[PDB]
Design a protein around this nucleic acid. Sequence first.
RNA 1: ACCUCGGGAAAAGGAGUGGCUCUGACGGCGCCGGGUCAGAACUGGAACGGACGCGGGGAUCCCGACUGUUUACUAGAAAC
RNA 2: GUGAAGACCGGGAAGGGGCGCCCGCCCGUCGAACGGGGAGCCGGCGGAGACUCCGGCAGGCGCGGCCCCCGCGGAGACGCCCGCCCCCCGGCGACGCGCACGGGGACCGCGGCGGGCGGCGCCCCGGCCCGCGAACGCCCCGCAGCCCCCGGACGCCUUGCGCGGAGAGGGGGGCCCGGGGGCGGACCGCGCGUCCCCGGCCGCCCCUGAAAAGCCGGGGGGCGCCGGCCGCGCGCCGUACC
Lengths: 72, 90, 119, 248, 95
Amino acid sequence: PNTITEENLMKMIADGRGKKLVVKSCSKGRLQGKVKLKLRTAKYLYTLTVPNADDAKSIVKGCKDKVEVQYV
Amino acid sequence: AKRTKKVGLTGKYGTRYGRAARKQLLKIETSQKAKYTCPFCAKDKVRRTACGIWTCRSCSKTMAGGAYSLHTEPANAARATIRRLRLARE
Amino acid sequence: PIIKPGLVCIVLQGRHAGKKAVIVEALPHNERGSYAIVAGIAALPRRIRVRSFVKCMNVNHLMPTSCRLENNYKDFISTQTVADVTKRREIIETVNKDFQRRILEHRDTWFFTKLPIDA
Amino acid sequence: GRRIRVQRKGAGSVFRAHVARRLGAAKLRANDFAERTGSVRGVVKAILHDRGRGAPLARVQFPNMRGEGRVNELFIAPEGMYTGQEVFSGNKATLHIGNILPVGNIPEGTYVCNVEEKPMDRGCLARASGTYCLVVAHNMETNKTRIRLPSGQKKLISSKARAMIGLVAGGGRTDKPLLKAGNAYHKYKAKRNCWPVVRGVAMNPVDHPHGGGNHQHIGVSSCVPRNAVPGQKVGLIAARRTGCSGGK
Amino acid sequence: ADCRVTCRFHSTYRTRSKIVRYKRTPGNRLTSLRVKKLPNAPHCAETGKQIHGIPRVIPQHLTRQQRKVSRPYGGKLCGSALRAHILESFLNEEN
RNA sequence: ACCUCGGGAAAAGGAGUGGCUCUGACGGCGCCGGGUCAGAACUGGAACGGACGCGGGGAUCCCGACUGUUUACUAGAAAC
RNA sequence: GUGAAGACCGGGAAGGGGCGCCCGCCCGUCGAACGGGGAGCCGGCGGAGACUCCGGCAGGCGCGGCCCCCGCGGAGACGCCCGCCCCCCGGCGACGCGCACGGGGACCGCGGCGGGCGGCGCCCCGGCCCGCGAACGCCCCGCAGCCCCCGGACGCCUUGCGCGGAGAGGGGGGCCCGGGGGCGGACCGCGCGUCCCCGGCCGCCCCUGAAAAGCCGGGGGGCGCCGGCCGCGCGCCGUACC
């Protein structure tokens, strides 16, 4: 797995490159209050750790509705 | 600080092997482990990799030599002959 | 005083090693060391385009030779140029064209003959 | 009676040479047109230790004269050969240690090694550590050169036969006492199964001619004839004289 | 309490290829991970010194920029050996 | 003693040793680690390597220098 | 080649290769379930099995579709944004032993802290049990070692050494380092040992410690790429248990 280089890379892949699902895990264990958006491209699983939940929402809108979005 | 009065590096062999063999070895093994002057880089770094094979630690030059001395006495005499005989031709 | 303008040298150390160069300018010695702006043949005329390197090199990395290759060169080659991005690219084209002319006429053959390095 | 140890040793099997991990056969550069009319030039790449030989062996790289590549030749190393030495092989090679020239060119009194017994033999004479042959005389009329072999014998060789100038290195190797049975074991491992040696007086009468009685004695003269058969030849072969006496 | 890892390899004989290092898995058990023998990085043809720039990975998995050095004779010769050859070639021509 | 000056030699022989209560040393200081080596009291049926583990030693003579090796299943030797 | 044969012995012989051409003396699809080798980890599942199943997550090696296009930067060591074939010159595979020393990993121990126990005549914050983080992908460091550039010396240093006008110290850099940290995958400290690997040394030898596929550079020649993304494939045999 790898860490996506910001939302610019995340959404560029989600707009045109291979993408299957963007899973939004939320604050597991309260180690962090951030939300983790994870995209499964054919090659790797790319994760964006978003400090603010509101910031994640705008990034999720950027992901095409063709990409499946799941929330956990 | 003089650990042994007579036997030198031959103290390794303890009391075994006789006196004559330990005296010859003292001279032979002092030459084998001696640092010789590099014929090329003029530095006393030459050490014996193998019998007949001596390598300068600093010069990095590997030279054919006597088994226990970088230069054998016969060989020095041979070198002097060849140099004189070559000069005689030219 | 061997190092001079219009002196052919061979680069000894660098990506352009083994290739002959010409000393367009010799910079005044400073804290960095002694350096010379050199323009040399990066690539031969062809296997059976001429390419030119125009950088400043430590004169310790240059082996002085006897051939001279006298050229106007310094009018377009200066410390201000070769330093900036662009302009150096323009002067590489002007030098590479001049090298093509000096090969088409078959001038300065020693400069345009590859150094035969073995092993 | 059992086939004796000498009889068994010639049948190969376990008594064969331990030739594994050995550099190769040390030989001179093949006689060629540029060695007949001219001199080829070679750089000493590496002075290395052969497994079974005390003398060091040098790998000298020569240009390929029948191709575009390079030829690597393993030679016995004359003392003074250094990494990067430019040796020369040929008729016009200069008189310097490590150069190989025909012995007719070589002046008299010169110390040479790896001499060719016959023209173009690749070298067969002085090859052991510290050994050397001496150019004694040149007979121009017969095109033959007398050399003094290491045993002090003198042989007439062809003037064409080639030799490498210099004593072979590793000299004085035999002066150091082996000291322990161990050191002999190590040296013989590198060479062949010839150690340890059991005296035949120690053996049974079936195993050896010297055999075994009640008092451990040869019981007949150790001196054996030259025409003794393979089992019989075990003592001093065709001894012209025996005993430890001063002279010669 | 009993960290006896057992044997990851097909046979128990511990040769140079069969070496294991132990870590902790996410499931709290000791694990055996094969330690691969690091390949030597290329060495100078003259000098025999590890050439700089090329990492000690099989060159099959390296990529061209990482398995090459940007200089004439970049991999075969070191920058001192190459400088020596440049000097000798030019100097021998003068004489 | 002797010696091939390496040994002999752990030669031969003696003395101490536990537990407590302390005191020194020794690094990386404000801090903060160390676990060794000394020294002292006080105690105990006159006890302490309290189990365990763990040379008896000395003077000679013969033989083989030595480390090795051997008759698997009667000889480990001075034999090889 | 030889021997009555059975058979034994073996280079000197018009002994191949994609390919008109062109190039070319001459064996092995024998031999090691311990040597070499392109690449696997975690979690789960069954009555019987797992580096094999299943779920997650990678890596290797091909093949196709599509897009694409053949150098640049630095004073230099080198960096970065990956051409191919022949013929050569190399490298990797690829290597001994030992004392010590240093660095990691696991193991261990001791504290704190959070959760759970047990015993309790007397004491007890003194006992015990648990507290997890893989391969791999990025990023940043990494002693020693080697190298660059300025410059021009009895200085620099190890446990032991060693080193330096054939270039020290000092200053600033490059590279390698079976490693660590961060992030992605997805309890907090602290110490002494042990064990394994590794590093720079040093000692040793009349002892000098395999080879080959496979892979990869460089020079010259000829030619023309590479790459990315997205699909898809990986056969044959062994695999229980002792």
